[PDB]
Amino acid sequence: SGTILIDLSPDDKEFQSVEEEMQSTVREHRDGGHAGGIFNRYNILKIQKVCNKKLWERYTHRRKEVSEENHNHANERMLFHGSPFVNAIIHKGFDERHAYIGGMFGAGIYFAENSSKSNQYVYGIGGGTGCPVHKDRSCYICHRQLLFCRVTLGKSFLQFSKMAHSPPGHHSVTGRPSVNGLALAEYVIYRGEQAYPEYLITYQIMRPE
Numbered sequence: 569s570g571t572i573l574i575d576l577s578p579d580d581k582e583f584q585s586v587e588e589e590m591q592s593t594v595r596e597h598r599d600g601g602h603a604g605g606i607f608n609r610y611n612i613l614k615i616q617k618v619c620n621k622k623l624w625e626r627y628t629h630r631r632k633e634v635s636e637e638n639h640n641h642a643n644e645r646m647l648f649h650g651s652p653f654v655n656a657i658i659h660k661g662f663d664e665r666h667a668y669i670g671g672m673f674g675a676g677i678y679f680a681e682n683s684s685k686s687n688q689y690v691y692g693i694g695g696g697t698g699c700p701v702h703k704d705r706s707c708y709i710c711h712r713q714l715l716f717c718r719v720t721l722g723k724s725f726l727q728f729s730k731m732a733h734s735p736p737g738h739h740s741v742t743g744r745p746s747v748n749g750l751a752l753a754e755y756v757i758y759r760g761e762q763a764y765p766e767y768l769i770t771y772q773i774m775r776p777e
């Protein structure tokens with residue numbers, strides 16, 4: 569595999585930065601919690617740094633290329649990723665060949681700047697049938713995993729809510745909010761090597777009250 573997970577102590581400022589980013593970027597969703605559950609906060613159980621030399625080199629190699637194509641600017645962002653495939657991704661890396669064709673921006677890998685948006689996909693598109701054990705999308709019991717990832721957007725194409733690759737001259741798509749469309753920003757890459765899954769976050773959504 570080559571992948572090592574480093575457990576971060578809650579007293580570690582690197583843990584605390586990821587924890588804060590996760591808690592602070594929660595929003596109320598217009599679906600009233602249908603996809604990700606009803607919560608305003610998480611129980612952060614565990615944050616692990618993902619260390620894989622092969623995957624890191626794959627990422628930085630792509631990043632150099634994107635940079636030369638975008639006026640020496642990678643347009644690198646730290647973004648949340650949610651999917652059922654977290655375990656595969658930390659071992660084998662992101663893989664566009666596994667992309668689901670039912671996305672707003674076609675067959676790509678979707679990231680978000682709001683943790684609560686990525687949380688809606690941990691059990692599948694629109695939350696699937698919820699947690700495996702209780703078939704509940706708002707399950708407070710079962711533990712979830714998000715990735716907090718290093719993502720190379722390069723020259724990002726701006727769009728509102730049928731697409732295979734980046735537009736010509738572009739490296740990603742930035743989905744922007746619209747009245748008849750997106751509520752929140754999402755980012756899409758069409759090459760797996762434009763993201764590194766840097767931190768694996770184990771959490772529950774917290775029951776409010």
Ligand SMILES: CCOc1ccc(-c2nnc([C@H]3C[C@H](NC(=O)c4ccnc5cccnc45)C3)n2-c2ccccc2)nc1
Nearest residue numbers: 651653656660661662663666667668671677678689692693
């Ligand atoms: C309307 C919202 O649309 C979305 C939201 C998120 C995503 C998305 N963006 N990226 C993803 C996943 C990351 C991709 N998979 C891998 O990189 C992958 C990597 C390595 N092995 C695998 C084995 C099985 C499946 N996937 C893999 C698919 N997905 C995804 C999420 C939930 C279910 C299915 C796909 N796709 C569409």
Ligand SMILES: [Zn+2]
Nearest residue numbers: 699702707710
């Ligand atoms: Zn459950």
